[PDB]
Ligand SMILES: Cc1c(C(=O)C2=C(O)CCCC2=O)ccc2c1c(=O)n(CCCCc1ccccc1)c(=O)n2C
Ligand SMILES: Cc1c(C(=O)C2=C(O)CCCC2=O)ccc2c1c(=O)n(CCCCc1ccccc1)c(=O)n2C
């Protein structure tokens with residue numbers, strides 16, 4: 001059931017912004033590890049005396065990495081005279097965010113029809129304002145409201161190239177890396193209490209609950225009208241046998257924040273081959289692979305979707321597989337992206353639900369919690 | 382002239398420590414960009430609840446990357462009960478250092494015969510103490526004094542594997558990258574006034590001035606007894622035609638700090654080939670190459686040291702060449718390592734002064750300031 005109750009017109013995920021200590025080093029690491037190309041910049045070389053911001057792209061996926069310069073460079077500026085390209089940026093907020101949470105997502109940005117309207121409607125419906133609508137070069141409007149913890153939901157709308165004030169990157173500095181990642185599928189928050197988090201976000205967006213089907217969590221998913229913007233939220237389940245990874249997150253993150261970004265690949269086999277080649281030479285590591293029993297058990301569960309060779313390819317790469325009543329999900333998880341056991345990345349590809357492919361086809365892999373557990377125990381004996 | 386006036390016994394450069402916001406991402410970037418392998422770690426997985434520290438090595442070169450965790454993880458600790466492996470570390474100092482200066486060198490560490498004695502003698506001779514001598518597992522002693530700005534000179538001495546509390550890194554996580562870098566040749570500070578900086582450092586070390594032979598700088602070099610520890614210091618020259626890069630450094634760094642690290646390569650051609658292959662895929666960029674006139678002029682200046690083919694190889698890679706009365710220097714400079722136009726890296730190789738090779742053979746390339754200028758002007762016409 002999809003009541004299509006969005007209170008404003010939402011299009012697609014637009015970009016994800018990381019707040020960093022040094023944007024250069026994070027962006028270069030992510031570019032190599034994920035196969036994303038350097039696409040735009042806003043920094044000292046473009047006249048920005050406030051923050052350094054670097055944009056990586058792969059297909060429609062946009063990762064933005066931002067860090068503050070010394071406030072002394074912009075001491076004489078005021079907001080009306082700012083050289084910042086992102087008017088919501090604040091030195092003190094950025095440093096406090098990073099000192100509190102470490103490296104992580106500050107902004108989940110969605111493209112909307114009218115960011116000014118989306119902001120007004122959201123706040124009228126309970127959203128806590130974070131940054132009011134600002135029109136950039138009469139061309140792009142940006143606004144922000146609080147999502148959870150210190151993460152904001154950023155609205156962007158275009159009259160009609162990332163943002164005014166950003167420059168396209170020189171061809172020589174823009175190596176065309178591509179491991180097959182194409183868009184952001186979903187962005188997941190960890191909170192202490194799921195109930196109030198859902199009520200708050202669903203309250204100001206009109207996003208509806210997306211239908212699902214001792215893991216340490218309870219979860220629910222909020223979706224836009226066409227279910228292409230997908231925002232799952234988790235809370236811990238306490239007293240468990242093994243300590244909840246949601247609770248570990250909240251402790252090391254100093255509270256609620258973004259837990260994982262799921263990146264859709266047009267060819268998850270090639271993406272995982274390319275990322276795993278680079279794990280130990282600057283890229284990303286992956287969670288330990290499931291035992292062979294997990295892949296033996298794949299034949300009975302998805303043998304009508306994947307050949308034995310394609311299942312064997314899943315086993316080589318450590319890929320997990322889950323299935324809905326509608327579609328099939330191939331997924332895998334990186335180890336944490338930085339120092340803290342907080343944010344990580346999921347790579348996914350979805351099979352089925354053709355009409356284009358409908359959003360969330362195959363679910364989010366929650367069935368893999370028990371299938372992993374079963375496969376571990378079976379492999380022991 | 383070398384009066385050999387060290388006030389304590391100094392051996393070699395031991396390691397350089399960067400203070401980071403996220404040590405994981407900087408270390409992974411540097412590892413790929415410079416060809417250094419992951420060698421040791423001290424972090425949550427080793428019981429360190431205070432800081433994450435990752436050690437890269439290439440030959441004898443040791444780069445340490447450290448960032449603080451949330452203070453909440455270690456809230457119940459006191460110094461006598463600390464889980465930090467580096468007892469001088471302080472959350473507040475680290476965050477203040479990084480917020481003030483951005484990514485950069487906190488510690489220039491030299492191995493000494495007795496770090497306790499070196500510290501006492503240094504402070505008795507005017508050194509400003511930063512962290513007193515601490516004995517780690519009855520095996521290693523570490524002490525720190527102020528060098529310039531917020532950079533410390535760290536003394537380390539061993540009774541007899543990096544530091545107690547560090548673990549050797551798993552073979553699978555330790556890819557054996559190597560582009561030929563072998564040791565730290567010199568570490569350079571930028572200060573507002575060279576005179577007092579030299580008097581202070583030479584005062585507490587007994588290091589002597591190393592003999593040299595409109596660039597924006599005045600410079601001098603302090604050296605240990607065998608001239609293997611080399612600490613150049615620069616100050617700006619104001620009112621210049623082009624603005625002094627030393628002054629730009631001080632403005633963007635918020636004052637004095639480490640300007641560049643010079644890394645000796647056993648094969649600068651191979652190092653530069655490997656680093657340049659990786660510049661646009663996560664590694665380091667290099668300064669713009671000199672015009673062909675610079676390499677035409679090489680034949681008259683070093684044609685007795687390098688063949689035409691080796692000079693042509695310098696031209697392919699953008700390598701600079703300078704010469705002493707004793708030796709020849711091959712050198713090249715990276716663009717800044719992070720967001721701010723502050724710290725950068727120099728790759729060098731020295732030809733001559735065989736006895737082993739004596740320290741500083743060929744100088745530091747100051748002759749390349751005028752040779753660059755001349756070659757630029759000549760190439761214009
Ligand atoms: C996150 C995840 C998902 C997932 O995507 C997701 C949603 O999108 C929304 C619904 C709730 C939810 O869970 C599905 C299955 C997972 C996992 C997962 O995380 N794990 C491993 C634990 C430890 C990994 C880890 C890696 C790095 C750092 C910390 C923890 C699994 O085993 N399954 C099987
Ligand atoms: C540093 C450097 C050295 C050098 O090593 C050095 C010493 O060891 C001690 C003595 C003083 C000194 O100078 C020698 C020659 C250099 C340079 C140098 O820097 N430049 C370029 C300017 C701009 C580069 C830059 C790169 C990245 C960011 C900011 C500035 C040169 O042209 N020559 C020719």
Ligand SMILES: [Co+2]
Nearest residue numbers: 188262346364
């Ligand atoms: Co997911």
Ligand SMILES: [Co+2]
Nearest residue numbers: 569643727745
């Ligand atoms: Co130098």
